[PDB]
Structure 1
Amino acid sequence: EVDHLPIYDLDPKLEEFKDHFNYRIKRYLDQKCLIEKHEGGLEEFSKGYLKFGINTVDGATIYREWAPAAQEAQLIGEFNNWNGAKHKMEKDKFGIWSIKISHVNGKPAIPHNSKVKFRFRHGGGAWVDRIPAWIRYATFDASKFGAPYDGVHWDPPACERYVFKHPRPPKPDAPRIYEAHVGMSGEEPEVSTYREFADNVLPRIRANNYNTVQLMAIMEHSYYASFGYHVTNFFAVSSRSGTPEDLKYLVDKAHSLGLRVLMDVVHSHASNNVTDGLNGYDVGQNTHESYFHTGDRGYHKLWDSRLFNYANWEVLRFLLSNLRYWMDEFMFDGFRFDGVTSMLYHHHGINKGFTGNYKEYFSLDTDVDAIVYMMLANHLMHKLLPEATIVAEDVSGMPVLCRPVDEGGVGFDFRLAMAIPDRWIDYLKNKEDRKWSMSEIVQTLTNRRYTEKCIAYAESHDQSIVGDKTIAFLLMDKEMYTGMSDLQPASPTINRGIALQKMIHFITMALGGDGYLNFMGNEFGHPEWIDFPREGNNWSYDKCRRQWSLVDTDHLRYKYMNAFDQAMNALEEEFSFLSSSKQIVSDMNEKDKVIVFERGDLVFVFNFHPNKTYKGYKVGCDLPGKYRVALDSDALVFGGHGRVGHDVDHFTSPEGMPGVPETNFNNRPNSFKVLSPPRTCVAYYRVDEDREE
């Protein structure tokens, strides 16, 4: 299949695995061919949410629910006082139940914003009442069992439907992503709303010159502390933060500010909550009549959750239609697929362990059903929205995960650089400054496939396990509580931490990939850590908030990390270095603790030494001429000591002959000399003497 793939041009080591890729591509073409034959193709098949769930047509309301294991089924709700006797559904030969309910005096039989459930029985058992799988909203009562949830028919009148005003922005040259969770986005540890987030937080994201918002925890999840990772109602906007119309307002406002918006797609697993989610449909049937595999294959041991059978036709309808639903109905510009490592392998990456050996990537442990779903998904999404960005969350480093389906790849645009936050946490927790290796830093940042695109980030929320301390807090710890006044000179510990927080974020951005990501609050060095109420912390909720008050006051020093973050993104907007394939690390000086490198058109000098200033430190560069400061972390506006001269011309000298590297300086054909105070990072640009002076 069939027979040379363009991926093999890129990475001829893939040809050893031709048999694997022949089978995968055959499975994909055959699944796509069947969807064309039986469902009118991928664009038609992924409009399932107009067929399943509750849809109002002229004069009547139809509801369909796939439940082959049910033997009788009815629709119940406030609209029939929870008695389904006059609302029995009919079952077709595929186990799809349907009912059509005429309007009552010209009005829909099921009022907008009223509660509903699917009622079914089998085996002569009692009625079981569950939430329709394609419900678009669900709310909890909070009359003890603190639940269960109810499904809510959502069909707002004209006065209450959000109508999008703004077009989607163009795809940027590189994504600079602000990742967020709306419920913990408020000052106080109460659940914040989509409207609050849209009005209070989107402006800050745009002020810091991000161009993309990654919105976590959108799909409904009855367990708040799951951070949106255990999904119950895949078509429903999480109700604790507002309604579907509130989310549409938020996405439209982001677009109005020039920001793209991606949603987290959690199609790697489903919540095991029986009353509230899709696990309610499992009554012990064979996997062909379930959303899920059975036995071990249907259970994720680490996430304590259920695992989809991606070969099942109704599950492909469900998941592909869910992608179209979020894109088309809420105007998203793309998505991140969370937990792709679990999808790619039958062992889910649970006990491993990827060494980069290709045998680990392509073997009987590779889950072809899951890869076929992802290829159909990426073919579909880029056909609906050719400028979409779809990110994969994959720790394994699977080759060709981020090459187009039409080349033989899985079709993602970018993957996350999941190994970089681990390195900084180990360094910050376990290594005295003098033992940090400049070469190990560079290797971690630069260790990637250059034929595929990477989003780098220095730190993250940690919620796939339990949140850890932020970089700032790992640097400064309890001194952040009493040592952040801008009135008083900072202690040595606070001066160290502010300077390294800026340096660690900026080297990560400039060397770590082709896109950048920042989670909400870390751009200003928010202290402490993120955690949600659970047994392990005695049900503490004081950490599920963001203390904007810290960055909004000019009397503290958070404003300085924030100003640097704004300037580092503006620098990328100006020079476009994330989209440059020029990346040359010219000096990893271990004794002096200096790293010099070029990315794009800029020369970067990082002095991680605790106390030494290098005067006249020679740095290699490509083009001769006159260089000046482009961004300097020592500037007073970024809380530094203002030691670097922004007006100073740095003239180059020639270093041997271009392409005779032994005659060059650190393999570079010119050099210039800089001032490099301790714990600073400065990027320099070449003056265009035809256009500047």
Structure 2
Amino acid sequence: ISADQVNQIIYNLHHDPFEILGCHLLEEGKNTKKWVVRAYLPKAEAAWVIRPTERKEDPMNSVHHPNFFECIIETPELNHYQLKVKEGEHEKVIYDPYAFSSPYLTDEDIYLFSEGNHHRIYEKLGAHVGEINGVKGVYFAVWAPNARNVSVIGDFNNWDGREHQMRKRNYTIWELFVPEIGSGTVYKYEIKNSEGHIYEKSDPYGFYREVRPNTASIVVDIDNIYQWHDEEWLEKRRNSDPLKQPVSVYEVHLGSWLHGSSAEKMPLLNGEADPVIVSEWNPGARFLSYYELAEKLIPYVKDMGYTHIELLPIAEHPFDGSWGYQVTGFYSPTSRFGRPEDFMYFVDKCHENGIGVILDWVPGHFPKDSHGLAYFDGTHLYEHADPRIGEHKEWGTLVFNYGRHEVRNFLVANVLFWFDKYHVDGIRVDAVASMLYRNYLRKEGEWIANEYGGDEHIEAVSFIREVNTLLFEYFPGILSIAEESTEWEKVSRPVADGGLGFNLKWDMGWMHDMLDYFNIDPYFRQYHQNNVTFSMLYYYNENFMLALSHDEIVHGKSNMLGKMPGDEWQKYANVRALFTYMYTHPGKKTMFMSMEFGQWSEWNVWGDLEWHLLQYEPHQQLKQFFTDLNALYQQEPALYTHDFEYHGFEWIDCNDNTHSVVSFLRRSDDPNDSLVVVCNFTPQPHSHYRIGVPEAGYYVELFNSDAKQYGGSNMGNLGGKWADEWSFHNKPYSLDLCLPPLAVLILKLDPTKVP
């Protein structure tokens, strides 16, 4: 580029910066092409072009001005890239602001979507504010290749589409530009199918939607509604390995954590809306907005000390009672809680408070509701036509055709969308087995094998691997979490190693072992010591997340206290011993709302949590217990640096079944950070109980779940214990401990104590 052209850009004299900024083809070779990417990045000292899908990164050079950058790259196609921009000591990674010069679908857009590889398809499908022929308006576009006709109906035309009939391009996608309408426009698509039947559909790629049970889509100027402040969070994320950090997740269903009064408006970020009543049977109650949740949930979580909030599915869904797991509006956060910019604010405020956001994401199926994806264009478009692979009959839902390019594209681009537009830090997928198996919940003779005679759903495995490959290339540093309940191998291993590419898997066998164990009267736990220890046998085959989820405190399973045997004191004590054990056992941590304060009743998705319980001491003490346990977890490296390495854990003794005692070490990089953990899973106290330790010195009683401030009896070692030179459990030194009833101790060597 010339200095004249550079200065035109710098001084805002250029007639159209898209002529020179962005990606431009320079020349075509035999087997490749030469491209330049240009950027004007005021205040940046350095930049790079990342091609994350090729695992390449190229520096940009300043050309004529220190803040004008060019990068020449040779490659056959340059469809997928990011700019890394350094401004002083800080780096950000963004999409190129000059990537798309028009709002309409190009030929290239259509080709990439036809192949399934358009990672930013949602910039062109759906509804977008833009300019065509010199006039501002909205561009609509929708994939409906077998439709006979499609029209845009909406507020702007009184729901009559005759003068807003769309144009079909390339026998596949319908489009329309509508001048002078903008964000807030309410619309649907009116489709006629090959039989001549006329019906109405929400926008598959819609960004916002009326409040259930109304289904119209709503136009959102998604890049001009919210100003983020989370660059430093995002930078630290990208540059960090979350597997080596503390990850303590507070699992939340947004609709049932806390309700407000329906006698007042729902406040929004600078605005308000009418209240959303929770149900016709509880009409005095309304949902809190994303804005109110940012003001209330976030400081709650921060004070409790969790590192992450995991949300049950927030994608648009028509029925409260599905919990979010039957989604019909994949590209929009539910309007129960307000607007897209209110959820953006929630995520930005989490990041400001150093809390990450993990979304449950639901790619496995979709319900049959007529407004949604089903039989979309008058054929089986999103779902597979064969019900043996296309329907989950026991659930009444439909299964995406994962092998179909444009369907795979809808879902792969949708995962990316949430990280792009909403800055989230991770996803979790429930019931991954529902995708992986062609015989899932199907009787003999009602499914068919794959092309090699097996039960593996090949197309779904390929889709899952593609999602995880892409997500980690575009957004290193995220969490991708699976629940898979059939012992499918290598769930949380890289794709290149034959994995599914997740980085964490819920340890469902651990959850079953623990909750079954603690439900046993303590005298009988001696017959089930194996429940305590078994999950370490297979532990190193995956990277495990220890999750006690919403699914475990519904349907007659009781909340945590109600699972435990004994009198009220003992029920509490069992809860503290389980969770102390959970937080010291190798693996990351997840627990669900209400567990932290000892709610007695099961989770009820139709009301809010029983917050009045926190007026009472035993609930306050249990909440303090979790506040202190989360603090300890973040403070002690040996509870999180080596979760997934043999070094991080070793049993000391786990043979004393008769007294349901077990003990173990956790380690980190510094040997002085090693912790001794001792568990007593009966109410029998022990005045003298010997445990082997690896070094001489004073072992501070760093944590004791029987402390009085947690509701315990206050038994323990009065600060700590000097080790004896008395060999025990195959170690040279040993502690003669007092073991409190139904309690866990954590001890730590203080190599500076005065003898």
Fold-level similarity (TM above 0.5): yes
Deviates more, 1:34-43 or 1:557-566: 34-43
CA contact (8 A) 2:513 2:532 kept: no
Residue in structure 2 matched with residue 503 of structure 1 by the alignment: 577
Q: Distance in 2 between matches of 1:677 and 1:464?
A: 28
Q: Which of 249, 252, 257 does residue 180 from structure 1 map onto?
A: 252
- Report the 3-state secondary structure (helix = DSSP H, G, I; strand = E; otherwise coil) of the residue aligned with 1:411: coil
Matched letter for residue 494 of structure 1: E
Residue pairs, 1:225-264, within 5 angstroms:
225-264=321-360
Q: Which residue of 1 aligns with 2:663?
A: 596
Distance in 1 between the 2:209 and 2:259 partners?
Answer: 26
Give, in whole Å, the separation in 2 of the partners of 1:187 and 1:84: 40
The answer to whether the 8 Å contact 1:215/1:262 transfers is yes
Superposition map of 1:460-539 within 5 A: 460-462=549-551, 466=555, 468-475=557-564, 493-511=567-585, 513-532=586-605
- In 1, Cα distance between equivalents of 2:539 and 2:163: 61
Q: Do residues 619 (structure 1) and 691 (structure 2) align?
A: yes
Structure 1 length as normaliser, TM-score?
0.80
- 1: CA distance, partners of 2:290 / 2:116: 30
In structure 2, relative to structure 1, the CA distance for the partners of 1:652 and 1:246 (3 Å cut) is farther
Change (3 A) 1:365 1:519: same
Aligned with 1:273 (options 349, 354, 369): 369
| 1:422-466, Cα deviation, whole Å (9 max, x unpaired) | 33443455x332112452222344243404211102x32128984
Mean CA deviation greater in 116-125 or 77-86: 116-125
Alignment of 1:264-413 (within 5 A): 264-275=360-371, 277-279=372-374, 281=376, 283=378, 285=379, 287=380, 289-348=381-440, 364-413=454-503
Residue 197 of structure 1: CA displacement? 1.8
User: Any idea what SS the aligned residue of 1:316 has?
Assistant: helix
Deviates more, 1:224-233 or 1:644-653: 644-653
2:374 aligned counterpart, secondary structure: helix
Aligned partners of 2:360 and 2:429 also within 8 Å: yes
**Pairing 1:1-400 to 2, within 5 Å after superposition:** 39=112, 45-58=118-131, 59-101=136-178, 103-104=179-180, 109=181, 111-140=182-211, 147-155=213-221, 161-167=225-231, 168=233, 170=237, 171=240, 172=242, 173-186=245-258, 190-275=286-371, 277-279=372-374, 281=376, 283=378, 285=379, 287=380, 289-348=381-440, 364-400=454-490
| Counterpart-to-counterpart distance in 1, 2:676 and 2:442 | 41
Q: How many residues in Structure 1 have an aligned counterpart in Structure 2? A: 596
For 2:77 and 2:695, how far apart are their aligned partners in 1? Answer: 54
Deviation at 1:187, TM superposition (A): 5.2
CA deviations on 1:167-196 (whole Å, 9 max, x unpaired) are 335354131111111111105664332222
The answer (yes or no) to whether the contact 2:675–2:747 under 8 Å persists in 1 is: yes
- Taking the aligned partners of 1:682 and 1:126, their CA distance within structure 2 comes to 69
SS at the partner of 1:267?
coil
Q: Spell out structure 1 runs of 4+ moving beyond 6 A.
A: 32-37, 40-44, 349-352
Question: 1:650 aligns to what?
Answer: 722
SS of residue paired to 1:522: coil
* Structure-2 separation of matches of 1:495 and 1:504: 14
Q: Cα RMSD over matched residues?
A: 2.9
Bigger fraction of residues in strand: 2
What displacement does 1:52 show? 0.5
Counterpart secondary structure, 1:516: strand
One-letter code aligned to 1:203: P
Quote the Cα distance in structure 1 between the aligned partners of 2:309 and 2:386: 37
2:739 paired with 1:676: yes
2 CA distance for matches of 1:384 and 1:321? 12
Conservation of the 8 A alpha-carbon contact between 1:400 and 1:409: yes
Give the direction of change, closer, same or farther, for the CA distance of 1:509–1:500 in structure 2 (3 Å limit). same
Residues 559-638 of structure 1: pairs in structure 2 closer than 5 A: 559-576=620-637, 577-580=639-642, 581=645, 582-585=648-651, 586-600=653-667, 601-610=674-683, 612-638=684-710
TM-aligned CA distance change 1:465 to 1:318, over 3 Å: farther
**Cα distance in structure 1, aligned partners of 2:716 and 2:507:** 32
Task: Give the superposition deviation at 1:319.
Answer: 0.7
Q: Structure 2 CA distance, aligned partners of 1:376 and 1:309?
A: 15
Q: Which has the higher contact order (CA 8 A, sep 6+)?
A: 1
- Local SS of the residue matching 1:64: strand
Q: Give the SS at the match of 2:472.
A: helix
Q: Distance in 2 between matches of 1:149 and 1:178?
A: 31
SS at match of 1:557: helix
- Which ranges in structure 2 are unaligned for 5 or more consecutive residues? 1-75, 81-107, 261-284, 445-449, 668-673
Q: Do 1:77 and 1:114's aligned partners in 2 also have CA atoms closer than 8 Å?
A: yes
Give the stretch that moved more between structures: 618-627 or 165-174: 165-174
The one-letter code of the counterpart of 2:549 is S
Cα displacement (A) at 1:604? 1.2
Q: Does the C-alpha gap of structure 1 residues 499 and 282 become closer, same or farther in structure 2, counting only changes over 3 Å?
A: farther
Match for 2:738: what amino acid?
A: L
Q: Deviations over 1:297-353 (max 9, x none)?
A: 11113322110111111012111111121111011012112221111111236789x
| Alpha-carbon separation, structure 1, partners of 2:113 and 2:204 | 23
Q: Deviations over 1:260-312 (max 9, x none)?
A: 1111110011122122x1115163x2x5x444343221111332211011111
Tell me by how many angstroms 1:94 deviates.
4.3
Give the distance between the partners of 1:455 and 1:129, measured in 2 at CA: 43
TM value normalised by structure 2: 0.74
